[PDB]
Amino acid sequence: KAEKFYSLACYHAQLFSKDPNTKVAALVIDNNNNIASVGYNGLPRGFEETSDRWEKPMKYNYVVHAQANAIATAARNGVRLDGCSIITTLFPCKECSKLIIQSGIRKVITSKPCKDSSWLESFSFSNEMFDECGIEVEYL
Amino acid sequence: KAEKFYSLACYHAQLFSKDPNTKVAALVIDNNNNIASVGYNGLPRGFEETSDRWEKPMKYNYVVHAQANAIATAARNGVRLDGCSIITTLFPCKECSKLIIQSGIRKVITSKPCKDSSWLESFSFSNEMFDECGIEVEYL
Amino acid sequence: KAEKFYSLACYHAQLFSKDPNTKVAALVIDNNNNIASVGYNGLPRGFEETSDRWEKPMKYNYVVHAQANAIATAARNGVRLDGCSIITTLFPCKECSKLIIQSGIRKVITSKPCKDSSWLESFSFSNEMFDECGIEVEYL
Amino acid sequence: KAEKFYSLACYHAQLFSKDPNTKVAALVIDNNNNIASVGYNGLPRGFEETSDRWEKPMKYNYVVHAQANAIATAARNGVRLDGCSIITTLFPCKECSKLIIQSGIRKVITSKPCKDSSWLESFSFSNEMFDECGIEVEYL
């Protein structure tokens, strides 16, 4: 089931993300394997999406990460995430990892980062926080 | 009312936040002036808070912002924030601004940043996003 | 957007549904295009899925429909659906249509049934109920 | 308490159901004996109720069952049913039994079917699914 959800998230990212380089999506799943929340990476809702704003490095000032969006959407709609797992097509950065911990999510399921990534340092802080705070990491 | 909530938020930060430089709190409030969520800045729950982890600039890798915490708590407990206002003792950084927009919060109430702040560039992106996305900014 | 959700729903069905003839999925989506609930067709959770139980016509006694599942999951988790739209890879049968009406879903988005379908009579009652009760039907 | 809730449901059916032959109601009860959801059998809300549409067999194309309505109402309003019991004046048919299982309801409390019933075959499938999926049945 986890691998199928990962495949489902890869497709969601390809369908919806306007990021020209890296399309990211995340699914928050409860203990009955039901979907509690979904997000993809994009500029905030209604924010004009121009070519200049989607180029690197400018885009980092504007882009909302997929995992942050799944959690913000649950806050917006009042969907309780405590105790769920998060399945994400990309390992969460340090800022998303903070949100995952504080939102009560207990497990991150994803793929091992391409260690040519420019996010490797951010991911190192993610792993330090996850392991000490007791959030499991599972790689498919 | 907004001013009394800001004062309450200031006291919340002084009571709870362990940041040695800048203690921040935020309150999310609905149209009846009822409190829907509260947060303060701090390291993730259960992350050992050593002096080295709270020193600047290392603390930025670990500290969870007050507004991010209030939103993440609402996702954790399934408390709907759509349509609420957020009263914060510090203007939200660009990342918190993305969360505010995506969680359906309509209005930010805070103090005008001290123009000696090191966060002015981040706040500059916050206001560009708030203005295009139609989030009202109210200064006390 | 509706078309991308329909495509995502199609992939969800192909990944998860064990029906050997017709795999169906549905997405319930609010006015911000956020996903509130998801379902696919399958036997009840934990019911052993033997070849005999999945053969037609015996499977109709056991199979839970995708739209029924998405609504039942929302009841299970307390996720409010009032005012949402439902995007489904198959037009809802008359029983699913009753659930859609009673759960406050306002709009059905799907494909026009293949006029070789064995469900045309059931769909005929669905549309009579949708029209009198004011549920919009939108075909992709 | 269970028998009093059953009596309460019998009265609710008599008060509200327009079915000319069989009036049905159901109460979803949590582990503190609080009422989480209530339904009765009827045509969908706002659907014209004519004599022709309430006659047998035509009515089966239109009538929403009491247990299906209690669950659809919880989906509509975002009331969490997971782990509750359902007390119903009539044994749930196979379609309602699927919804009961998927909505997380753990126990069905009702009266033994009159085994002159035309629903006996549908009830046989209900019992097969309940017993294998671990939903208890209690007869008063």
Next chain:
Amino acid sequence: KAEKFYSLACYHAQLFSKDPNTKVAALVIDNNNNIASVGYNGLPRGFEETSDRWEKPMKYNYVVHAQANAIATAARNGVRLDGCSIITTLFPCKECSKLIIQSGIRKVITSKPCKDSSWLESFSFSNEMFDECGIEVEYL
């Protein structure tokens, strides 16, 4: 509909309430006539119900009112009551009226008090608060 709910409430009180003098129940109902919460008058859950504790006037120190119970249950289970109506077999006392106003209930439906009632003074304050705060009172 309001009259049928009042009748159902009367029966609920007769079935469940242990008050030897006056059995009271209340139903909180949304704009679709769905039941959001139900209560009846009784001592707190688990408080031993001796004859001395149910005798007047000692019972007033312990008895929980039906309308207070329906609201407290909604707080317990997180069921939103904002905008609902309350149908009660007895006019709410001044304390219940404060709860009704603060929980966002918009309308009280009940019977006109028997002018031999010992609660007329309390009801007098109830109506002054309902009128200034804009809660509609409807008598059956």
Next chain:
Amino acid sequence: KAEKFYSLACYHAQLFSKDPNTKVAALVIDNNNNIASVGYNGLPRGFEETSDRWEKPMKYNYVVHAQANAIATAARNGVRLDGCSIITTLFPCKECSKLIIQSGIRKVITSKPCKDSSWLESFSFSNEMFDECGIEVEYL
């Protein structure tokens, strides 16, 4: 943490309560130390606040207690209080104690009453109900 929440509640009462003699506030806290609900004592929302209505003894006919307001607000907004603790600047009266028990709150954290209080008899009934119904009382 409990003592800091008590200090936070004392300030909230001083900021917001218009009671000329005794300002009261209460915080409902979950097992992760997150704030679920907040209240202070005051006349009902929108009720004209005149000097005559805030004088003793007239005010008791109108004033909503802080703990009752925290619970009514949770009912209004659909915030689930079951299993939380309540931290209050004043010991709950017998009527608030009934609401605390019925709303699923499991622990009262407060300060020992000034035993020159005119509420001592009401508090005696509170303690009888709390101890028999299994709600803990903790004094700071």
